[PDB]
Amino acid sequence: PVARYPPIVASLTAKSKAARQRRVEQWQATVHAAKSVDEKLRILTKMQ
Amino acid sequence: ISHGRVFRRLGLGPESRIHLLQNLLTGLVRHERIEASWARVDELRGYAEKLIDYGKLGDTNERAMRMADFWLTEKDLIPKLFQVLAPRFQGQNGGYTRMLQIPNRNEQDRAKMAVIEYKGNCLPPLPLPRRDSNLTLLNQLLQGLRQDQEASS
Amino acid sequence: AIQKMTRVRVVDNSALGTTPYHRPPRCIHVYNKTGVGKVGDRILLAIRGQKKKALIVGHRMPGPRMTPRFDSNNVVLLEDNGNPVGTRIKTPIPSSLRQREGEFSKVLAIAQNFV
Amino acid sequence: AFQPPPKPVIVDFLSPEFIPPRGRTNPLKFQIERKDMLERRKILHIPEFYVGSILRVTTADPYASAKTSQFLGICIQRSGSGLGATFILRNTIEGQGVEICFELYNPRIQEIQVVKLEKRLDNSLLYLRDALPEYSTFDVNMKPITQEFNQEVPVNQLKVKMKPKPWSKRWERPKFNIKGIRFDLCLTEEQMREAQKWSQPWLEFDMMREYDTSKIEAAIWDEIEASKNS
Amino acid sequence: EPWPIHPWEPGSSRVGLIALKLGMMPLWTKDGQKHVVTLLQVQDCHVLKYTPKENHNGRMAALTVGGKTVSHFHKSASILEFYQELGLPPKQKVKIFNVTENAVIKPGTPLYAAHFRPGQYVDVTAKTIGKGFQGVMRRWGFKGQPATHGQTKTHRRPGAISTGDVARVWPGTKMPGQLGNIDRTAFGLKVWRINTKHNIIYVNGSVPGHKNCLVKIKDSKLPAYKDFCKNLPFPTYFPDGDEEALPEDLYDENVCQPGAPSITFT
Numbered sequence: 165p166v167a168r169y170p171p172i173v174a175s176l177t178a179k180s181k182a183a184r185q186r187r188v189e190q191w192q193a194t195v196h197a198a199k200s201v202d203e204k205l206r207i208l209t210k211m212q
Numbered sequence: 213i214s215h216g217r218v219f220r221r222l223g224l225g226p227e228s229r230i231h232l233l234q235n236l237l238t239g240l241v242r243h244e245r246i247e248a249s250w251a252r253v254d255e256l257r258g259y260a261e262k263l264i265d266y267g268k269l270g271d272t273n274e275r276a277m278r279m280a281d282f283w284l285t286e287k288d289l290i291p292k293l294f295q296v297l298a299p300r301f302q303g304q305n306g307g308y309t310r311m312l313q314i315p316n317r318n319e320q321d322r323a324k325m326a327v328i329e330y331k332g333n334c335l336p337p338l339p340l341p342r343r344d345s346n347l348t349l350l351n352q353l354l355q356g357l358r359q360d361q362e363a364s365s
Numbered sequence: 366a367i368q369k370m371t372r373v374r375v376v377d378n379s380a381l382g383t384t385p386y387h388r389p390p391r392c393i394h395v396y397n398k399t400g401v402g403k404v405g406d407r408i409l410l411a412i413r414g415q416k417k418k419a420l421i422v423g424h425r426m427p428g429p430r431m432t433p434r435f436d437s438n439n440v441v442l443l444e445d446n447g448n449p450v451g452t453r454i455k456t457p458i459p460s461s462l463r464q465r466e467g468e469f470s471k472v473l474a475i476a477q478n479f480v
Numbered sequence: 481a482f483q484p485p486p487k488p489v490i491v492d493f494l495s496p497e498f499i500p501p502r503g504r505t506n507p508l509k510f511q512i513e514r515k516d517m518l519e520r521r522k523i524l525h526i527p528e529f530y531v532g533s534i535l536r537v538t539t540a541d542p543y544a545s546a547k548t549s550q551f552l553g554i555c556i557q558r559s560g561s562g563l564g565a566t567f568i569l570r571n572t573i574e575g576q577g578v579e580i581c582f583e584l585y586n587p588r589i590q591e592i593q594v595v596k597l598e599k600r601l602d603n604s605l606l607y608l609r610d611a612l613p614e615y616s617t618f619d620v621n622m623k624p625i626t627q628e629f630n631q632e633v634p635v636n637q638l639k640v641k642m643k644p645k646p647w648s649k650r651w652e653r654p655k656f657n658i659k660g661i662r663f664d665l666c667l668t669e670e671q672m673r674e675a676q677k678w679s680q681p682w683l684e685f686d687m688m689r690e691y692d693t694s695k696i697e698a699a700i701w702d703e704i705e706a707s708k709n710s
Numbered sequence: 711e712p713w714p715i716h717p718w719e720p721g722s723s724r725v726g727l728i729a730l731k732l733g734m735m736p737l738w739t740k741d742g743q744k745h746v747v748t749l750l751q752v753q754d755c756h757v758l759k760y761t762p763k764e765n766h767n768g769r770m771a772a773l774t775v776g777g778k779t780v781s782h783f784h785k786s787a788s789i790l791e792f793y794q795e796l797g798l799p800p801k802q803k804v805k806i807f808n809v810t811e812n813a814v815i816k817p818g819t820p821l822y823a824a825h826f827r828p829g830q831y832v833d834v835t836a837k838t839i840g841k842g843f844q845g846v847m848r849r850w851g852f853k854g855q856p857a858t859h860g861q862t863k864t865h866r867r868p869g870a871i872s873t874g875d876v877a878r879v880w881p882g883t884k885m886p887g888q889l890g891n892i893d894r895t896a897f898g899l900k901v902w903r904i905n906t907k908h909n910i911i912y913v914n915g916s917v918p919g920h921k922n923c924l925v926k927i928k929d930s931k932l933p934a935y936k937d938f939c940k941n942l943p944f945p946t947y948f949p950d951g952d953e954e955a956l957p958e959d960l961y962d963e964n965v966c967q968p969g970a971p972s973i974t975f976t
């Protein structure tokens with residue numbers, strides 16, 4: 165009875181800069197969902 | 213032996229063909245008129261005709277909604293599909309798309325290319341092949357035949 | 366479809382078909398000119414290290430319409446004179462075997478259930 | 481010889497064979513076959529039954545003691561188009577499962593009686609061969625069960641146990657789409673993940689392999705009504 | 711203006727028809743057996759031209775029969791002129807039937823599926839389903855090599871084709887090539903049912919050629935049924951000659967009709 169529309173967010177596996185930004189937001193959300201500060205620091209600094 | 217076959221082989225397989233057709237359909241929905249290979253456009257014509265019929269089923273139809281979600285990769289086109297193309301295609305039964313063969317691409321491949329266009333779009337009309345006017349010699353002779361037939365009854 | 370090297374199941378109550386053995390009863394040769402046997406064809410078996418004759422009762426391959434199909438290749442032991450060695454048959458038997466009564470008279474005389 | 485007074489009353493489908501195939505066969509053949517099958521149905525009463533229902537079929541057997549042969553079993557599947565439609569009945573008799581494929585319009589059939597009109601979770605339950613014998617055992621002398629029309633043919637949601645591997649077919653593959661098999665007790669998580677590699681999600685949204693038969697069914701229903709009024 | 715009708719003779723032959731292959735159906739017999747019939751629909755059968763016996767063969771005359779109607783816009787000028795002089799629209803398939811001189815029919819005569827009566831043997835000629843340039847295993851049925859016992863690029867090769875001393879291959883050697891797109895004739899096909907309203911013939915057995923294709927039907931030339939045409943209408947079936955409408959469906963003496971008492975054995 166009510167129209168249900170999917171979100172207008174960009175794709176996740178695409179090559180576009182919007183997709184790259186979505187992946188960046190995904191890993192930042194993973195950092196947010198991390199519980200301990202040690203895990204947060206490990207995720208934030210695991211890239212070299 | 214390819215007797216009784218309606219789907220042609222494209223891409224790297226069935227799933228690759230489905231993805232290519234989905235991308236072409238998304239582009240066609242977004243731009244209201246696209247040009248591609250003649251075989252690809254001919255294959256996409258059926259899916260384009262089916263998509264309009266699915267959209268005409270209503271916005272609240274869950275099957276149509278999920279079909280649009282699968283096909284239209286750009287989710288901003290689904291509201292466009294359900295609120296522009298479907299409303300403007302109501303009395304039309306199957307005349308939703310127009311396909312015309314264009315000259316070969318200037319690239320060295322020299323591929324056979326076609327152009328597909330949704331009717332009633334906000335784009336300049338294509339150079340459609342128009343029939344000869346009734347003022348021609350043969351057309352006027354046929355008009356005379358028609359007048360004689362009408363007068364005979 | 367029963368052919369050579371087929372492990373079948375003996376139905377009639379006989380010593381060979383009841384006493385366990387370390388090798389299942391395999392087919393030896395199909396007396397039909399075709400290497401594939403059907404219901405009602407004399408066949409040769411190697412049961413418990415000795416040769417014997419048998420009659421095909423049912424097979425797992427689909428056949429003609431309205432023809433019963435079984436879940437096991439059931440066979441009944443038969444002697445060289447055409448008389449079954451078993452006492453009675455418990456499992457159901459297709460009714461098409463009663464079409465030819467001359468060669469299967471004593472074989473069908475011991476059958477209880479017909480399907 | 482007293483009169484016994486019971487119930488006071490105090491309270492206030494198109495058969496699958498009629499569907500033509502997806503081929504480009506001329507409609508005249510379909511019309512002729514439908515006319516012939518309606519003529520056959522005028523004499524032989526073919527009741528409504530789905531896959532999973534239990535039926536009893538009487539056949540003309542010349543080599544039996546009596547010319548009538550009775551076979552009762554559950555309908556494994558129905559397949560075919562037009563006059564050649566067939567249905568498979570399965571029943572375990574004395575531990576030996578027997579499957580017979582009867583033809584709907586065969587003249588040798590005397591009577592088809594539905595003793596239990598009941599749907600199941602699968603459109604084609606070919607897995608009863610690999611299932612336990614309890615699900616294939618049915619009493620031959622069971623009595624017919626009559627149900628109200630408002631029940632709308634209730635579907636029996638029954639999870640069926642399975643014999644250990646191997647099976648007759650790979651029922652865990654997505655191509656079968658079976659929900660009536662209790663897979664959580666017969667298969668492991670690794671096997672379930674492995675079976676998913678044959679899944680083809682694009683076939684559900686292909687939009688072109690589907691078969692639309694609304695107008696065909698309407699025309700067939702109109703012809704059936706005309707034949708009945710005839 | 712009908713041509714004179716000559717009496718049937720034992721050494722006479724009848725003309726055939728050109729029908730369309732609709733499909734296949736089951737048909738049960740009164741003895742409990744089940745046969746498969748093929749539906750051949752006679753849409754437009756017309757005699758186009760007549761060729762004299764001396765000018766065609768010197769033994770038997772030739773009658774030309776046309777198939778179903780086709781469009782004028784895709785036929786040649788000579789064919790269109792011939793059909794304009796004949797007075798009929800162009801046909802798709804044009805065939806020639808060898809008939810005796812006493813069974814000749816005037817050109818322009820239409821023909822109906824009632825030409826064959828229930829219970830008769832006919833020969834069917836048609837182009838079979840063309841499978842194209844197929845391999846030798848599918849064409850001649852040659853067995854292939856073992857699949858995985860070390861064979862290298864040979865699983866479907868024909869293998870040896872000739873002998874060393876001959877230094878050549880014989881013309882009769884079986885090799886891969888075109889398969890299917892050739893005219894074949896099936897003999898001795900029994901007919902069970904004749905539907906008059908739709909002009910449909912039910913022929914027992916398989917019919918060479920795909921569905922919705924033209925099929926040339928004639929009587930059986932086999933010696934077992936050489937003189938079966940005595941009871942049949944000798945010239946052809948004239949719906950106006952009898953002045954009586956035939957029943958909708960004519961069945962054979964053994965065909966279990968759709969309206970049946972559900973026969974049971976005794």
Ligand SMILES: [Mg+2]
Nearest residue numbers: 413414415416
């Ligand atoms: Mg030994």
Ligand SMILES: [Mg+2]
Nearest residue numbers: 647648649650
């Ligand atoms: Mg198997």
Ligand SMILES: [Mg+2]
Nearest residue numbers: 839840841842
């Ligand atoms: Mg071909």
Ligand SMILES: [Mg+2]
Nearest residue numbers: 853854855856
């Ligand atoms: Mg091989």
Ligand SMILES: [Mg+2]
Nearest residue numbers: 859860861862
């Ligand atoms: Mg090697």
Ligand SMILES: [Mg+2]
Nearest residue numbers: 857861862863
């Ligand atoms: Mg190899």
Ligand SMILES: [Mg+2]
Nearest residue numbers: 860861862863
């Ligand atoms: Mg090598």
Ligand SMILES: [Mg+2]
Nearest residue numbers: 875876877878
């Ligand atoms: Mg030489």
